[PDB]
Design a protein around this ligand. Structure first.
Ligand SMILES: CC(C)CCC[C@@H](C)[C@H]1CC[C@H]2[C@@H]3CC=C4C[C@@H](O)CC[C@]4(C)[C@H]3CC[C@]12C
Ligand SMILES: OC[C@H]1O[C@H](O[C@H]2[C@H](O)[C@@H](O)[C@@H](O)O[C@@H]2CO)[C@H](O)[C@@H](O)[C@@H]1O
Ligand SMILES: CCCCCCCC(=O)OC[C@@H](O)CO
Ligand SMILES: [NH3+]C[C@H](O)c1ccc(O)c(O)c1
Ligand code: NA
Lengths: 449, 120
């Protein structure tokens, strides 16, 4: 349809605020939608939504549309909002006096809260009408709107205050910046772990029994960098989950799956070396081939039971307004769980493996000083990394995970996500820590030439 | 850096005895395995006696009873007091040391070897 250059700016504004979907999706009420929040129908029939879409677009879309087609739909919604604004004696005086950029901020509010909701801002609207930008920005910052949706409102208020697109220019610079850093993190995890996996499979010297456990670690860390970290990066750079409610449950399960398998494998490796370093002869006899494959299967079976079973059975769901809101919203994929699962998952994933690894590696330090310049220094710094890097990466998260479940207000969501990325970073550190043998080095060099 | 010296090798008649001595210089981690390996012409390398820093032993069952391995208190040396020699024990005996300074893997220290031929 007819596009303008103003029209494209208000399109990119909400593309950032609300997201763009070029395929039919469901909104918070289960209603079929496309584009930037364009309701197709309240009918539960996907074909009926496809008929409404084809009538409006003027093409057999079969549910998929282009960006230009989404802008056609978007501009119609903007025209309707504007016609509403002009019929309302509370919004027309303010609207008529605003420049085009601040005029898009007001339309943004109406898309978020509705015509009636925005008309209740009597005093802020009067201040905007009188071009009292800083005073209007202060008053709006005190709003219920600001406290409910601070990031959205910071961007909109900056638009009222300055009349520029700076808040959205800055958001997009940040988005590309983190996307770079995320892709780098994804590269290190995948490369380092795929390098360890192939080194074991193409070298008979490396196919020992201890390194069979390290293959489990490298595999639990490989799925992390292929499925968990990449999709977890989409929530950071785009502020939303973009893949529907069903994939949020699966992604969350694969997340808890791999984190459980990876840390418990560090626990098995910690036990393995303890037996070989202390009682190497009973070690070589009791730990058979099938027993080593017995532990790894047990680790993964436990990991599936604590991830796919409770999450898909909705046992992990909290029952507050904040939690139920995120569950009904496909665009929300926050890790919000009840107290029982938050503790039970933390114990099975982190706290039990921490206690074993801490106790085991402390006793290796004990029996080393009993049977004594000395090389005890080079082995102590080694233990300091195996436990230091592990603890430093996951301890902040699993402290916040248990606390936040009881006191939701103490752990900010920003800080909570950050602690979870420290743990994500362990999947890159593990191949550096556990594959430092001369056998790996001769193999790594033989793989890269 | 770390070198291990290898003494006690020689030729002896069937039924005699020997006493291999291996002294390892350099610094090593407190938990280790000092062992002896033999390779006869033809057949590949095999272990005879290993001794852990705690005291636990492991003797090849074709070799146990006749052979005894020991460690020195406050000295990085291993002694293989061997008796009742048989002509099937003609092999170069190697001194091996398992270092556990890096906790995740084993770090082998090998030796040059001492020839041992048993006559009749
Ligand atoms: C060595 C390891 C096992 C020690 C870690 C113990 C952890 C799990 C402890 C340390 C501090 C503890 C928290 C301290 C305070 C509170 C507030 C309380 O009203 C509910 C429990 C809660 C939230 C505790 C949960 C358990 C907790 C997080
Ligand atoms: O004409 C307004 C019309 O469209 C609105 O679309 C908004 C929606 O309010 C928000 O949730 C967000 O997604 O942006 C959408 C883009 O239009 C509403 O969806 C609709 O109900 C309203 O009448
Ligand atoms: C080691 C790399 C750490 C990067 C972690 C970035 C997390 C950031 O805080 O994102 C929070 C929210 O914006 C997302 O919901
Ligand atoms: N994203 C949640 C985080 O990865 C995680 C992993 C394993 C868990 O047992 C858990 O509670 C949370
Ligand atoms: Na959701």
């Amino acid at each position: 349809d007819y596009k303008d250059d103003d029209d494209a700016n208000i399109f990119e504004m909400l593309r950032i605020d609300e997201g763009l979907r070029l395929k039919i999706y469901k909104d918070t009420e289960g209603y079929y939608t496309i584009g930037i929040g364009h309701l197709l129908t309240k009918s539960p029939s996907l074909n009926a939504a496809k008929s409404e879409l084809d009538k409006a677009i003027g093409r057999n879309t079969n549910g998929v549309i282009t960006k230009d087609e989404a802008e056609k739909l978007f501009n119609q919604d903007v025209d309707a909002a504007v016609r509403g604004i002009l019929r309302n004696a509370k919004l027309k005086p303010v609207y008529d006096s605003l420049d085009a950029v601040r005029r898009a901020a007001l339309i943004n509010m109406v898309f978020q809260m509705g015509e009636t909701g925005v008309a209740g801002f009597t005093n802020s609207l009067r201040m905007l009408q009188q071009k009292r930008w800083d005073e209007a920005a202060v008053n709006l910052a005190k709003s219920r709107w600001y406290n409910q949706t601070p990031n959205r409102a910071k961007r909109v208020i900056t638009t009222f205050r300055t009349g520029t697109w700076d808040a959205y220019a800055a958001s997009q610079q940040w988005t590309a910046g983190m996307g770079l850093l995320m892709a780098l993190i994804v590269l290190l995890i995948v490369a380092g772990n795929v390098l360890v996996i192939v080194a074991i499979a193409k070298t008979p010297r490396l196919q020992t029994l201890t390194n069979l456990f390290i293959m489990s670690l490298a595999s639990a860390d490989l799925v992390m960098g292929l499925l968990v970290v990449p999709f977890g990066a989409t929530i950071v750079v785009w502020g939303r989950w973009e893949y529907g409610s069903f994939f949020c449950e699966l992604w969350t399960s694969v997340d808890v799956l791999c984190v459980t398998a990876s840390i418990e494998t560090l626990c098995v490796i910690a036990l393995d070396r303890y037996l070989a370093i202390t009682s190497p002869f009973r070690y070589q006899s009791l730990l058979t081939r099938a027993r080593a494959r017995g532990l790894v299967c047990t680790v993964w079976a436990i990991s599936a039971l604590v991830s796919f079973l409770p999450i898909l059975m909705h046992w992990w769901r909290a029952e507050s307004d904040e939690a139920r809101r995120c569950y009904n919203d496909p665009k929300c994929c926050d890790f919000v769980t009840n107290r029982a699962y938050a503790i039970a998952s933390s114990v099975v994933s982190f706290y039990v493996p921490l206690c074993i690894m801490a106790f085991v590696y402390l006793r290796v330090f004990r029996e080393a000083q009993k049977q004594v310049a000395l090389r005890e220094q080079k082995a102590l710094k080694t233990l300091g990394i195996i436990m230091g890097v592990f603890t430093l990466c996951w301890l902040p998260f699993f402290l916040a995970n248990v606390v936040k479940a009881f006191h939701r207000e103490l752990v900010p969501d920003r800080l909570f996500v950050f602690f979870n990325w420290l743990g994500y970073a362990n999947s890159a550190f593990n191949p550096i820590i556990y594959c430092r043998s001369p056998d790996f080095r001769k193999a790594f060099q033989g793989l890269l030439c | 850096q770390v070198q291990l010296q290898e003494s006690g090798g020689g030729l002896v008649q069937a039924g005699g005895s020997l006493r291999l001595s291996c002294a390892a210089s350099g610094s090593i981690f407190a938990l280790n395995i000092m062992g002896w390996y033999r390779q006869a012409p033809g057949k590949q390398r095999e272990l005879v006696a290993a001794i852990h820093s705690g005291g636990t032993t492991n003797y090849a069952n074709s070799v146990k009873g006749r052979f005894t391995i020991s460690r020195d208190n406050a000295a990085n040396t291993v002694y293989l007091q061997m008796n009742s020699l048989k002509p099937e024990d003609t092999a170069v005996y190697y001194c091996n040391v398992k270092d556990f300074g890096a906790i995740i893997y084993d770090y082998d220290y090998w030796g040059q070897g001492t020839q041992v031929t048993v006559s009749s």
